[PDB]
Design a protein around this ligand. Structure first.
Ligand SMILES: Cc1nc(N)c2c(-c3ccc4c(c3)CCN4C(=O)Cc3cc(F)cc(C(F)(F)F)c3)cn(C)c2n1
Length: 246
């Protein structure tokens, strides 16, 4: 038996655990790619649902969506689906925040620029009738050219309550926390978990509300306990704060 993957690629390392993501070099074209390997479900209608997904997702092109290349099936001696995506930077949004722990390092322009890219990506999906469902700093990447991409789709800190215990409004909740986290640097993991757990419950640090009153009202709208009351992604983009950005 000849495996497409082993034939065409030289594996480099593992990138994601699970649904597994490898880094591999294509032999013909000499580029490195992120390759996700999914073990397909064994029942037919479960597979058919997954295959209908790759078909819808294949049509996706956007500056905030990671670039797609190829999708194929293998059945060695049960069945694996392989997905070839562009390889992003080693350091993700979580890595980025961790190396920048002072408010001087969290420039208001840079952070709103990063956030806007994520929001624009989510608006894109929502208009196609899709949703991400998996937004979080560790699953937000930069390209070799520092363009922000939302990560894999299709820790529960960034999950909306109705996700844990439901519509596209789940993505809106996730955005809320990311916006907060971007503007509010942390010193320790301990602090981070405590503060973020409190923010989910609308208990904001005073210094934040003092410094970013505009963004504060936005985060409140995005973190509404009633999903109905949360804004759409388009409303977030069409907000006053996203004007005159250099
Ligand atoms: C350095 C680096 N780069 C990555 N691209 C990744 C990825 C990664 C990012 C995005 C996506 C994946 C892995 C698998 C699926 N994927 C997606 O964005 C969904 C997607 C988008 C499409 F446009 C098309 C498809 C599909 F057609 F189904 F293949 C899927 C995960 N990890 C850990 C990564 N690490």
């Amino acid at each position: 038996y000849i495996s497409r993957y082993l034939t065409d690629f030289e594996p480099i390392q593992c990138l994601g655990r699970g649904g597994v993501v490898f880094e591999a070099k294509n032999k013909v074209d000499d580029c490195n790619y992120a390759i996700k390997r999914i073990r397909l479900p064994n029942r037919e209608l479960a597979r058919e649902k997954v295959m209908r997904e790759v078909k819808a997702l294949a049509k996706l092109e956007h500056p905030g969506i990671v670039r797609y290349f190829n999708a194929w099936l293998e059945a060695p001696p049960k069945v694996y689906l392989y997905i070839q995506m562009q390889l992003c930077r080693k350091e993700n949004l979580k890595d980025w925040m961790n190396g920048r722990c002072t408010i001087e390092e969290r420039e208001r322009s840079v952070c709103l620029h990063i956030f806007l890219q994520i929001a624009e990506a989510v608006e894109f999906l929502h208009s196609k009738g899709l949703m991400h469902r998996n937004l979080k700093p560790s699953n937000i990447f930069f390209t070799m050219d520092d363009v922000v991409k939302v990560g894999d789709f299709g820790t529960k800190l960034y999950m909306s309550p109705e996700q844990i215990h439901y519509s596209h409004k789940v993505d809106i909740f996730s955005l809320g926390l990311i916006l907060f986290e971007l503007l509010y640097p942390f010193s320790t993991q301990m602090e981070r978990v405590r503060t973020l757990t409190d923010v989910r419950n609308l208990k904001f640090p005073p210094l934040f509300t003092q410094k970013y009153p505009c963004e504060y009202v936005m985060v409140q709208d995005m973190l509404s306990p009633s999903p109905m009351e949360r804004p759409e992604a388009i409303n977030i983009i069409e907000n006053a704060v996203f004007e005159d950005l250099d």
